[PDB]
Amino acid sequence: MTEYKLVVVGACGVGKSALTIQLIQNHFVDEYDPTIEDSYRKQVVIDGETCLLDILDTAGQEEYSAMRDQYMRTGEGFLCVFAINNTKSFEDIHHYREQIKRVKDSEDVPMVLVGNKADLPSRTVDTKQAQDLARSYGIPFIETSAKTRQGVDDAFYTLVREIRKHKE
Numbered sequence: 298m299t300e301y302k303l304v305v306v307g308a309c310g311v312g313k314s315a316l317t318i319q320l321i322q323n324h325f326v327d328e329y330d331p332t333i334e335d336s337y338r339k340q341v342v343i344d345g346e347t348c349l350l351d352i353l354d355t356a357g358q359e360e361y362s363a364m365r366d367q368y369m370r371t372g373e374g375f376l377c378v379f380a381i382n383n384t385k386s387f388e389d390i391h392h393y394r395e396q397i398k399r400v401k402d403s404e405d406v407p408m409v410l411v412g413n414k415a416d417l418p419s420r421t422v423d424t425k426q427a428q429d430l431a432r433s434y435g436i437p438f439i440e441t442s443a444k445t446r447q448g449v450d451d452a453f454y455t456l457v458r459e460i461r462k463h464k465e
């Protein structure tokens with residue numbers, strides 16, 4: 298079967314681990330150690346294709362390193378996650394997109410913008426502002442809740458479809 302290597306990136310606390318564990322293990326984690334960086338795998342069917350999702354949930358220190366560049370470079374697509382109630386996490390996205398372009402040495406890398414925690418009140422990032430950003434990047438934007446499951450499959454499956462488009 299076809300393997301898709303996905304990498305989940307974004308600020309501490311946006312829900313990278315919760316999104317990954319909801320997709321792979323079908324449950325919402327109320328807490329997940331922010332030092333646990335690992336890959337999680339699941340066989341799924343997307344548009345009739347049986348495939349293996351190989352998802353790297355990034356964690357540890359906010360730092361640049363050749364060591365990290367080496368394994369991040371293996372990613373075929375990037376899920377760029379911010380939390381809709383954390384303006385700083387939205388502002389951070391630019392730094393992730395720029396480093397993805399650097400490590401992949403390309404202006405054309407499969408990417409999806411994800412606004413997580415859609416279930417929470419008191420949002421600080423307007424959906425239309427995130428939609429405008431995604432339009433400016435030429436990538437899809439999906440609002441998700443790792444808690445309720447809203448948009449979770451759509452976010453990961455859309456990234457798989459972006460990877461297929463790049464492979465042509």
Ligand SMILES: *CCC(=O)N1CC2(CCN(c3nc4c(c(-c5cc(O)cc6ccccc56)c3F)C[C@H]3C[C@@H]4C3(C)C)C2)C1
Pocket residue numbers: 306307308309310313331332355356357358359360361362363365366369370392393396397400
């Ligand atoms: C609370 C812990 C947690 O969940 N964290 C996510 C993070 C670990 C990794 N992550 C991170 N932050 C940034 C950058 C990268 C990054 C670094 C590389 O060397 C290579 C690549 C390649 C693609 C995407 C991202 C990277 C990173 F993994 C780069 C800039 C954005 C910040 C940055 C300012 C260092 C944070 C802690």
Ligand SMILES: Nc1nc2c(ncn2[C@@H]2O[C@H](COP(=O)(O)OP(=O)(O)O)[C@@H](O)[C@H]2O)c(=O)[nH]1
Pocket residue numbers: 307308309310311312313314315316326327328329330331413414415416417441442443444445
């Ligand atoms: N209400 C709500 N809480 C969430 C959601 N996603 C993550 N969380 C919570 O936010 C915190 C940070 O999530 P985590 O997955 O550890 O974020 P990470 O640091 O990006 O891996 C945890 O307490 C999660 O339970 C969500 O969609 N909705």
Ligand SMILES: [Mg+2]
Pocket residue numbers: 313314315329330331333354355356
């Ligand atoms: Mg985590």
